[PDB]
Amino acid sequence: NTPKDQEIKKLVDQNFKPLLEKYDVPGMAVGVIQNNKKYEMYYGLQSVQDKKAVNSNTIFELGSVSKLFTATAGGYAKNKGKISFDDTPGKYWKELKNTPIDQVNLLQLATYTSGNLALQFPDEVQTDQQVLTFFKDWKPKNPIGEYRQYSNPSIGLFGKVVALSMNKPFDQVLEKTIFPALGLKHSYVNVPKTQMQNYAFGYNQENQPIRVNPGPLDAPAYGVKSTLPDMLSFIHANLNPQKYPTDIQRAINETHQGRYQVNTMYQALGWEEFSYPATLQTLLDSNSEQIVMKPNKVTAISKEPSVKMYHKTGSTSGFGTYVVFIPKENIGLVMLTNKRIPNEERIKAAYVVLNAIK
Ligand SMILES: *[B@]([O])([C]N1[C]=C(C2=[C]C(C([N])=O)=[C][C]=[C]2)N=N1)OP([O])([O])=O
């Protein structure tokens, strides 16, 4: 009676479109993939001052969704035998050998359980020497492996170690190896001069234009930029790993493996994992201030569900991201905004749309 493309458009209009007015968001891209059919919805402006409309070429900052590519790079290196998750960083970054940080394994760095790493490096840490000094001077606090504290330095160090293991800088690992293996054409650590015209401005809480600041180990933690079509291709790879070459197939499957529990949230590699079907409140609880900002004692997985779903939020000063996929239903959703909106609104909108689709 109404074509599938129009039904998805109507659901996204009902649930995502009102957030633009509510939070004064200049631009938004919402993608759905179902049964290998991609649906792209674009709203508003990539640049207010240049009057440039959001389109399929628009490049957004992914923020912490960048961690999913770092995790994928880690999975790739492990399954090629370049690293083991039981290894310590000193094995690859020789200047960390026999330092206290060398008592933390790569899996613990990737999944934020060092027991003494905060969300950000200190502001003063900028250069490679300052990053090295920081990790050399690092001392434990909580028992290693027992406490989850969401941390850019933690997965940043994991990223740097993965890069050393593949004998390339981290930016080249993604741009030359991982992005091409996933078939991504417009995904960047460094947006080249020829694509700056497609790079959206972010907008802060006063709707002033801004972009991400350079930082220590930024690329592996929050430094990736992508388009809606690329992020839908990335969700396709996660929904259909069997259709990709062996190396990247095993990489993707590695990122789906739950490592521990924090109540109903299973920490996989980058991805957060949930028993499917999941309640809205289970997905909302995953990004509570308690889980995101504070240390939490982890428990061993005591119930492994047969059927799972996965999501990840991402924010920079000027951009919001949300990606979610459900293997059982062969469906996923990407939301990109050039203004931060509350995580709860991203998760709720996606939940209603993915549960409403026939
Ligand atoms: B990640 O996005 C955690 N997160 C937020 C940021 C960040 C970085 C900047 C910047 N200009 O460097 C500004 C604001 C925020 N880095 N890492 O995960 P979630 O939990 O979705 O915030």
Automatic annotation (TrEMBL):
Q: Which GO terms describe its molecular function?
A: beta-lactamase activity
This entry's Enzyme Commission designation comes to 3.5.2.6
UniProt KW keywords: Antibiotic resistance, Hydrolase, Signal
- Tell me what reaction this enzyme catalyses: a beta-lactam + H2O = a substituted beta-amino acid
Instruction: List the record's Gene Ontology CC terms alphabetically.
Output: outer membrane-bounded periplasmic space
What InterPro entries does the record point to?
Answer: AmpC, AmpC-like, Beta-lactam-related, Beta-lactam/transpept-like, Beta-lactam_class-C_AS
Q: Which PROSITE patterns match?
A: BETA_LACTAMASE_C (PS00336)
What range(s) does the Beta-lactamase-related domain occupy? 12-356
Cross-referenced Pfam families, in alphabetical order?
Beta-lactamase
Top-level EC class, please? hydrolase
**Which biological processes are named by the entry's GO terms?**
antibiotic catabolic process; response to antibiotic
Q: Which PANTHER family match?
A: BETA-LACTAMASE-RELATED (PTHR46825:SF8), D-ALANYL-D-ALANINE-CARBOXYPEPTIDASE/ENDOPEPTIDASE AMPH (PTHR46825)
Q: Which family does it belong to?
A: Belongs to the class-C beta-lactamase family.
Q: What is this protein called?
A: Beta-lactamase
